[PDB]
Design brief:
The protein is mostly helical. It has one domain. 49% of the residues lie in helices and 0% in strands. The protein contains 3 helices and no strands. Helix 2 crosses helix 3. It comes from Homo sapiens (Human). It is found in: Nucleus. This is ZZ-type zinc finger-containing protein 3. Histone H3 reader that is required for the ATAC complex-mediated maintenance of histone acetylation and gene activation. Component of the ATAC complex, a complex with histone acetyltransferase activity on histones H3 and H4.
Length: 75
């Protein structure tokens, strides 16, 4: 289906696939911050934060899009 898509400032297939993997290698823990820090370090290009936000639209954007991800927006 999707088979990839375009994006002005969206991740790149290269990273996309990378993260997905790192996610498995790096399991959850008490602190979610430290978690992203580890993965990001591996990526080299991305950062804890950048990775954190991505995760949101990776796990939350799966529950039949039932959970609110955004609200007051435009454009």
């Amino acid at each position: 289906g999707s088979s990839g898509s375009s994006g002005n400032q969206l991740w790149t297939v290269e990273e996309q696939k990378k993260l997905e993997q790192l996610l498995i290698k790096y399991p959850p823990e008490e602190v979610e911050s430290r978690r992203w820090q580890k993965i990001a370090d591996e990526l080299g290009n991305r950062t804890a934060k950048q990775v954190a936000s991505q995760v949101q639209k990776y796990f939350i954007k799966l529950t039949k899009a039932g959970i609110p991800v955004s609200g007051p927006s435009s454009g």
